[PDB]
Structure formats: C-alpha cells, structure tokens
C-alpha cells in the first residue's frame, strides 16, 4: 500500500512536541485505499508503512523522505494516492508533491557548524558539523535512541534546513555521530530530469563514458546491439551472470546475426577470433579482468544482479576499462534500482484463494491449473522445492524439483511438466513457461554486528523485491500469452542489497581471484561511486580490515570448502584452519564443518570462534589472536539503518 | 483487543504425521475482527493460528476447548462467530488458557498411548519429532535455532497415533540453540475440565487449625490492611500485616489505633514502635532485615499487595512462605485487589475519557485541556523522571500550582489541602496515599528486561512498556474512592496482569547480598516458595542461573557497595561489582554514566580497557574480556534456560 501520515512534529526558543494523528487500524486503512482526508499540518511529518514507521520533512514545497523506508511508495493524499516526484536511490532520497497544508521549511543558506536534529520523539538533539552529509552527536547516545527518526530535520540555529536524518554511525552499538542527506543534494535533485531516456543503446562516444540501458528481456539489448557495434568495427564484450545464457548466446549469435562469438565460462571456453566475446562475470574475474586493449565496448547486462560475482565484476570494469582503452561501459538491465513491477500486456496476474488441492504458502493451488503444460513454481528454499515435487509426483504430475546443486538436465525441456524451482532457475536455464506460480518470498543473507563476539551471517526469507517479482514473473509472457499467480500481492523495495555481499566479496576475492583485500576495495569503491547502481552501506573499510586479519589459511581446507560450493568458503575454511591448528572442534557438527570431519577422533575443548556463520553448539573460547583482531575491527565506524 | 483465528494447521489422519498451513486473514482482516470480537468465518482443523495485534502465535483444540498459553492470550477474548468469547479457564500457573472450542472446529483428543515418541508441530507446518524426558520437558532428537520456534508455542505435541500429548509452551536453549522443549501436559489439561470454573477468594479465610496457604481478593477499601487485620486481633489471634510501601504501612497503623481501638507495632526503617499489642504492621522491606518469621510471634500474616513483582515484596513473601508453618503461624493470607490474569473492569463511580488532540498541553502525542486541570486536585501519570520535570515546567508556566514526583524526593512536596496538580512516576503509590479528582495516565512505564546477549554474557535493558492491567487498575484507583472521580487515558490497551521479567529475579539475588546478608543459595531457597506457591505472579524459571552467577561475585568491595546502596539506583550489587572489578584493575568503568559516580574521584588514575562483565546500560570504552570472573559468567550461560517462544 501507500506510506501514511500518522502525526507530525510541531516546531515551535528551538523546541518541538508530536501530535499522533492516527491509530493503527486509521494507518492500515489509508494504506490501503490510498485516501486520507484528515488535515495536514507542520514541517515534520511522522509517517509509517504496514512495517516500519519514520520521518519526512517538507522543505520548498516538498516532502522529503529516505529511500530505505518508503521505497516508490505513492503517499495517501486527500484526492488518493501520490506518486513520487522525486526518486533518488543514490542518495537514499524520495520526494512527494507536499500536499495543501503542509509548510515547508526554508534551505539553511549560510552554513552552521552547530545544529540541531529533531528525533520522532521531539528531542532536539546538538548535533557539530563534520563534512558535507555527517555531523558528530555532542553527546554519545544508544542507536535505538535515533531508530523511527529517518528523514527527520537536520536544522541550523535560525531554524533553516541543512538536510534529512539519514544513518546512524555506530562503534560498537553506540551512535555518535549522524549521516544526513544534505539540503544541496535534495536542490540538485529538483532539477534532474523528468524521464530520461534509456530504452535506446549509446553511440560509441569519442572519450571513456558510462551509460546506461534500460529495456527488456529480448529487446536485442545483449544480442541485436552488440551485433550492431561489430557491423561499425568496434570489439565487444558482454558480460552476463548466468553460464545458460552466456553458452546460449553462442549458437543464436551464428543463426540470427552470422557471428560466431568468444565465449567464456568456468565450465566451457570457445575462441573464435570473433569481435564479439561472451563471458560469465565469473570467468571475466579468473581470466584477470579487463585484457589490454582488447575491447572498446564492454556491455555489463543484467547489472540489476547482486550476487557477489556481478558486483565484483562490474567494479572491476568500473576501475579498469578507462585505463584498458575501453571507450564505452553500459550498464543494462530490465529492472534497475527505484523500479516497480508494471502490467505486463502479455501475462495475466491472478491471486491464489484457499480453493485448490495443493497448498501453497497458506493458499492453493487447483490441480487443473497445472495438470498439464509447462509451469514454473517458485519456492523460497530447497526443503520447499522437494516437498512439493513429491506432493506433485504423488498425484501423477509429471514434475521435477530444481536449485543450486543440482544439474540442470533433471529439466526435461519439452513435454508437460511442473518445475518446483528457487531462484537458482534464473541463472542455470533459460526457457519460458506457460505460467508462473510465485510464493512471493526468497531467502537472503544478513550480516548482524552482534559482538558475540564479532558478527554473524544470518539466513534469513523475506518478502521479494520489484525485481524479483518483476524477473520470477518474466519467466512466462515472452512470445507467449502467460499467467502469473502468486501469494501475495506486494513487493518490498528495490535495488538495495545488504552488507553480508560485501563481505562475500572480499571472501570470493580471496578465495578465487587471487585477490587482496586492498585490490577487492578499490574496485568496490568503482562499483559504490557508479549512479545508477545497486547501493549498499559503505563497510568497505571494516570488512577490508576483517578480511585483512585471516593470513595463512589451509590451502587443502579451502579447496574444500570451494569444491562443496557453499557460501563464505574462505571464512569457513578460516574457521577451519583455525580450530584444526587450535585442536579444537568446530562451532558444531553441520555439513558446513565437514572439512574437519577427519580430525574429530583428536579435536576437543571450546571452539576459537571467530565469527557466527550459524548455529554454534560447542563451547566457546575467546583468547585466539585472531578472534581477539577481529574484536578489534568491531570498534570501527559503522553506518547503520535508521 | 480480542484474539482473532487468522489461520490453521491441517494435519494428516492418516499415514505419517505431516502438516500444512491455510491462511484465512490478512492483516486488515485481523485488526477489524480484534477491534471488533465477530468472527464469520467458518472455523476448520483442530489448530488454529491465532493473533492479537502485536504477536502470532498458535491454539490446539482439545476435547472442545480451544487451548493455547497464557503469555501470548493473556486473558484476552476470542472473536467468534456470535461475538466474543470469554475464556472458560485462566490457569496462569500453567500458562494455559482456554476457551470453548467454536462451532465448526475438529478437536484432538488425548494419548491413550502413553508413548515417548512425539512430535511437535509449528506453525509453519513442519513436525519436529521430539524424545519425551519428564512429564513436560522433551529434548529435540536434533538442536535448532530458537527462531525456528518462535510463533509456536500453543501448538501441539502428538504421538505417533497423532493424538494430543502437550502444547507447546517454551523452547529450552543452550546459548541460543534450543535442545528441548517445555510444554503443558494434557493431563494439567485434563484435571482443568473437571474442576471448577469459578473459585471465590472474595472473603477473608476462617482461621484454620492447622497451617494454610489463602487468597484474599477484594477491593481496595474493602479493609483488607484494617478491618481484617482488626477482626481476626478481635479473636484474640496476633497478626502481622506486610506491605511494600513506609507510607501505606504508618497509615494503616494510625488508621487502626483511630478506628479499630488498637494501637498497634509499627516497623519500618525511619519509625519502629514496640507497643505490646497483637497487631504488626510492617514493610517487606524491615521484616527482612529483621531476618524474617520469629517464631510464635504470630498466628496470621498478611501479605498485602501480593500483586508487586518488586524484589523486596517477592523475597518478602518468599520468606514467610518458607518460615511460617515452622515459625508456628496458622494462616497466611495473599491478598490483592488485582490477582494474576485479572482484568480492569469499569468502575461505578470513575468516568473514563478518552483524551484528544484537542488541547493546549501535549502529552504522549495527544492533548490535555487546561479546563480540565485549572482548578482542583489532579494527578498525572508520566512513565519517566525527566517528562515529569518538563510537563511540571509546562504547567507552572500556565499559572498552575505543578508538583513532580518520582523516586528520590521528599513526599511533603505534596500539597495536602492545596489546590494542586501533581505530575508523578509510579513512585507515587508506595509514597504518597492521598487520592484526587482526576488522573491522567500516559498508559505506559519504564520497566527493565534482561537479554541473554551473549555480548559477553547478558544485558540490563531498561525500557518503555504498555501498561498493564495492574498498573492501569492502581494508576486508576488514585481517584473514585467514595466521590466524583475521572479517569483520562491516552491508550485503551492493556497487558496480560502477573508476569514478571528475569531481571526481577536477578534483582532478588542483587538486593539478597546487598541488603539482606542473603547468599545466593538461601535466596533460592526463598524464591522457590514463592514460584512454587500457587495464585502469585509468575516467571520462568531461571533459579539455578541467576543463583550460579551471584555465587561467582565474591569480594564485593564494601564502600562502593555501600554507595550504590545509598543512592538508591537499581542493581546496587552489580554496579558496584563490576566497579570493584574496574577499581582492582586500575581500569575505566563502561562509561561516565551517573550509574558509575563512585568512581568518578579515581577518574585521573583510571586507565585501559574495561573488563565487562554483563552490561547495564550503554559501553563506550573499549571492553576486555579475560577477567577471571567474566568468565565465570560465560561459562554460567551454558545453563539451559527457557526462553519465550
Ligand atoms: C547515501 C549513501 C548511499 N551509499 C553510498 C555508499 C552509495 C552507494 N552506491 O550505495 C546509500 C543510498 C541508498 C541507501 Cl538505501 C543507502 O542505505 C542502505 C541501507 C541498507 C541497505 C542498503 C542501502 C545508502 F547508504
Ligand atoms: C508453567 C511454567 C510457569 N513458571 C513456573 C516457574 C511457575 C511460576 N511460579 O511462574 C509459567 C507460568 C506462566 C507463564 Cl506466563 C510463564 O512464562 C513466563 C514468561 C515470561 C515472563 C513471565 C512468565 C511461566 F513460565
């Protein structure tokens, strides 16, 4: 639904006191209907989503207000929703029209060194200047003292606005000091145009240029236009996330444009001599980067990806293609950052009920809908996957479960079939359905600076994003009359990714491409600095430093743990390496330790514990060095959510 | 706020045990049903899933009655289908509620099997199968995260025939890692439907010839710190009467020799008076320090306000439950006017209004009219100190006579007589006993919780709370008493009344070595006698880890103890342990917080990393964590606690 105005905060010899204008079943309502009639009052507004609830401040005729917590949303107004006029995932910056009794408040013009923040709880909180978007807190506070306070005013003595409540920056769970959006960001952003253009492939500029692609699926955006650049002389390289689409691109490029390209992925390599290359980002990072000179345009396709290869890929481009004596970079995608899931002429959506014989997520589906055909069911994990496979194959259905693991010929690519998948499908095979079924939820990693001792990577399944709803729901409708059914009918916002990627970073730099911590930065810092992009919470110094400490690791662990293909294989083979050497046994006993299986006849005592990757069930002990290195990392500087 | 079925859990009869969810609600759908308590929908399966408006969780029907747990339903109504449902059994003991199973539910019905093979089922559909240890522990044939088991609790336990074993009622972790489960065993059940619905407690007992455990629930004003003390002396027993707060204590005495013609002992710490007669009255708080029962001193105690999870009326009950029967007493009386589970009912002479926006004062994002406060005697309910302070100023400034009131200042601040407002914390009602026109009530307090944060060993969380049903009955109660009274209120929520957090425990330990020469181990011994005892408030329990860590806290410096003692802050043995600790080290303590002003003068001498022990607030310094004692602390958490699920 739409974000909400639940109160507002008066400003007043600076004061303020909040007025609470709505109740929960009032926000839920209005939420829904997009419609709220009430009065409209102050500069400070308190608005709220059906999650999580926060500030906008209203200044040059505008309500401000972060990206983190209202996405795109439409704001309910008194004639229905309202549609942002501004959205700058960027700089973590939305804006509606204010509506008729809102005042605004006037740019701090001159510049304090001395301002003073307005929490949702009326506080006026001292806040000395640094730089262009942080300032230092006085007095040092808990970071739950600043929660729900996102896009509140950041404001001068006068009583002018510097900027908007951004971020909290914490050592060790303690903020002291503020990143805010400054009001100069917000000035640039008025003026930014009303729609680009981005549906039409560059010309090849004169000079080095970044630039940005924005079209569907089998729009030629990754076949029809690098054929184009070769027909003009130039050498292009695209560079796709998926090993199916890229050897894909092979045998298509020679029947519909009469190229033969390069092709490049870890399971098969293809040299041709054409002036067309394909690579996985993958095999783009183990073939070195960016070869000298041997490509103009470099084509970075499904750029909306952020899995830890395409950001590392494309950050390796953004620092070296300049220098390599590439003219042309384009970031292109379907999808990117800000988007919502549109109406897609071609594909009918329908809710699930609770009518049908198979359940699905607490709804159903009607075996006549799939009894036969070809459909694609997405389920959040793999337990998930099995389980209804198995109900499908109990009734007679012809169906398969697919996901990471496992090879991609349990297909069979023609005749019925239902495929019970995870989002592994969107990567490993690449053909259409006559439907789609989507749970509406996926499974991610989260990173929790939890000082237990050091931080841990949590599991977690969350509502889907716009872009995965919007690629899960692609996958019928290409030259086809499709449907898509789903759970639910919402969509958390997109183009954010959390700092666990980071981290994973670092961990494939290390454990595949020979690279250093330092050599993983900079070409992050390429990918943070890009417009356009994916965005994150810069952690670049703190997991430098992590990833900084772990020297020496086992080379026979670490195989391992790559072989087995599961996550983090550097961190865990570290663990590893460490307790092997400690002589003692790992965090516990799951699949993810069984490089150490060999060992436990010998191994006891309380495990070394560096960091939490999942459930620990031994002992614990705190005095290895290296634990001790990395408590110390933890007192670095940390943006936090707010 | 009623309970709303939002969905269930279908489970197969037939086969091998296997489950699956339906959902019947979205969000919307459940706030309307809550608000309202009419349920249309039709009701299938024998599980429901359930919610309120801030939690989920589950309900299993067993022989007609929809069951599930006491701190997720507290004493809420289920919205069904002809309006709300009221529960038929409130067994807070147990952390079991119960309401008549709706028209159109399945219901299970209990194990005749006797079995040791169980299964758990969650609410997101998986059966976890389960070993049977006791009659309600069970350990997990394989560990899994707590968060795996949030949600589930009052859902069902079943053997493999797939009949009702238990409902799930908390998840037994190891350092975050549950290995069993807790779970209400259908015979508590069972006993339950064969009982009883109603049992009067409205009455003072008669006294019997041998030692007996009473309930006395009546009304304030009912003379249950007077006339029943009064009329059981007019027998010719002697009598003890306990109470929390100095103030409620005098009063009742003078009140006693004034009006029941007895003069009677009077024992707190500021005024102690031996008259010879067979009425005491005293403070939790003195009969501690006293040591206790002496025996054939009385033949009746009465512990009044039974309701306060205070640490000094818990240990206070803990103790004459313990010692009475030995100490030679008779009777021993728990009486409150808000037992666990109650709920505010309302009030015959107390108008109840909603505040608004309209007004001139803000308060809690709503507004106080100056009319209704100009003139007269009024009270107001803030949930902190430094409000308190900023509304009294509001006010004063408004030409009207303000007054704060909180924990650290003198009581005669209070106008007797004098046309008055006065701005207070809950610190009122052990303080002052005087009564007013209107309250207002901000409907929330500050209360503390303790987290197993394991960062290194566990934390102090202070924190804001909705009210209770408790402190909205005894905010409430401070006008209405014989005359015109209102009521304002921001919130017309309201907690499940009788639940106490861990930290109270701990508080209990903390003030056992601090005030009352109490080791660890005779504090348990106490605390024992009061869980064990049944009709008082609960908790979990955390006995064994609490009294395990405060056995470790050896050598307490005695002048900073005595420093944090006088000055009255929560946790006076913790803060001052870990400022031993800090002092031996020649270390900093976490911060400069007023929380560590004993060690302010030795602030040029202190130096380094702090060796934390638990956290008690905010920790700026840099932290070390190889004290001995640190860990000592880390191995206590390999306890196995229950934790909320
Ligand atoms: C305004 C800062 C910007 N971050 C820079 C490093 C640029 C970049 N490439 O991300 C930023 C923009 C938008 C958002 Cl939602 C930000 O915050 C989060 C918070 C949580 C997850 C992801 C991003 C943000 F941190
Ligand atoms: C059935 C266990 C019982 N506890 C025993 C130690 C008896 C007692 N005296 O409390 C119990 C009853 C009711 C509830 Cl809400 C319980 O759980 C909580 C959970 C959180 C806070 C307080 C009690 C509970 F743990």
New interface residues.
């Given amino acids: 639904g739409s974000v909400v105005i639940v ?1 507002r905060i008066i400003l007043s010899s600076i004061t303020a ?5 709505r109740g ?2 009032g926000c ?2 209005t939420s ?1 209907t997009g419609r709220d009639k009430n009065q409209v009052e102050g500069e400070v507004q308190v608005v709220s989503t ?1 999650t999580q609830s926060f500030l906008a401040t209203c200044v040059n005729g505008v309500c401000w207000t972060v990206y983190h917590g209202a996405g795109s949303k439409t704001l309910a107004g008194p004639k229905g929703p309202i549609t942002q006029m501004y959205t700058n995932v960027d700089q973590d910056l939305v804006g509606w029209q204010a509506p008729p009794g809102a005042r605004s408040l006037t740019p701090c013009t001159c510049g304090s060194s001395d301002l003073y923040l307005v929490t949702r709880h009326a506080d006026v909180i001292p806040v000395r200047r640094r730089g262009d978007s942080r300032g230092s807190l006085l007095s ?3 970071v739950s003292y600043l929660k729900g306070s996102s896009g509140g005013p950041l404001l001068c003595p006068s009583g002018h606005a510097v900027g908007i409540f951004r971020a909290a920056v914490c050592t ?3 903020a002291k000091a503020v990143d805010f959006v400054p009001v100069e960001s917000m000035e640039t952003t008025m003026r930014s145009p009303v729609f680009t253009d981005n549906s039409s492939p560059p010309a090849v500029p004169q000079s080095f240029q970044v630039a940005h692609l924005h079209a569907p699926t089998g729009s030629g955006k990754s076949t029809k236009v690098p054929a184009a650049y070769a027909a003009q002389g130039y050498k292009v390289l695209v560079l796709n996330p998926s090993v199916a689409a890229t050897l894909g691109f092979g045998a298509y490029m020679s029947k519909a444009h009469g190229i033969d390209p390069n092709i490049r992925t870890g399971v098969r390599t293809i040299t041709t001599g054409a002036p067309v290359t394909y690579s996985t980002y993958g095999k783009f990072l183990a073939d070195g980067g960016c070869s000298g000179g041997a490509y103009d345009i470099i084509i970075c396709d499904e750029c909306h990806s952020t899995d830890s290869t395409t950001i590392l890929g494309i950050g390796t481009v953004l620092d070296q293609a300049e220098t390599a004596g590439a003219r042309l970079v384009v970031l292109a995608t379907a999808t990117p950052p800000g988007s919502v899931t549109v109406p897609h002429p071609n594909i009918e959506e329908v809710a699930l009920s ?1 009518t049908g014989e198979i ?1 699905f997520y ?3 589906i009607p075996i006549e809908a799939i009894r036969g055909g070809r459909h694609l069911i997405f389920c959040h994990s793999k337990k998930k996957c099995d389980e209804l496979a198995a109900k499908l194959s109990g009734l007679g259905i012809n169906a398969v479960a697919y996901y990471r693991g496992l090879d991609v010929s349990v297909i069979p690519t023609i005749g019925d079939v239902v495929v019970v998948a995870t989002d592994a499908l969107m990567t490993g095979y690449t053909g259409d359905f006559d439907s789609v079924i989507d749970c509406n939820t996926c499974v991610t990693q989260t990173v929790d600076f ?4 050091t931080f841990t990577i949590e599991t977690t399944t969350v509502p889907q994003d716009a872009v995965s709803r919007s690629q899960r729901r692609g996958r019928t409708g290409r030259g086809r009359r499709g449907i898509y059914r789903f759970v639910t009918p919402g969509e958390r916002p997109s183009g954010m990714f959390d700092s666990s990627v980071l981290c994973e970073c670092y961990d494939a730099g290390c454990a595949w491409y020979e690279l250093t911590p330092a050599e993983t930065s900079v070409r992050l810092r390429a990918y943070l600095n890009t417009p356009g992009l994916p965005v994150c919470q810069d952690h670049l110094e703190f997991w430098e430093s992590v990833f900084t400490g772990l020297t020496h690791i086992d080379a026979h662990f670490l195989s391992q743990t790559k072989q087995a293909g599961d996550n983090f294989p550097y961190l865990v083979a570290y663990q590893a390496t460490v307790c092997a050497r400690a002589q003692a046994p790992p965090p516990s006993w799951d699949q993810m330790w069984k490089c150490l299986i060999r060992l436990k006849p010998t191994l006891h005592g309380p495990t070394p514990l560096l960091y939490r990757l ?4 031994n ?1 614990v002990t ?2 290895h060095p290296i634990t001790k290195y990395i ?1 110390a990392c933890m ?1 670095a500087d940390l943006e936090v959510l707010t």
């Fill in positions: 109160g006191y909040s007025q609470q204008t929960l079943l839920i309502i829904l059906a040092p506070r808990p060790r769970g303690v609770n359940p607490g709804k159903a939890s000082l237990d001792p999942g459930a620990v069930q002992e705190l005095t408590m007192s």
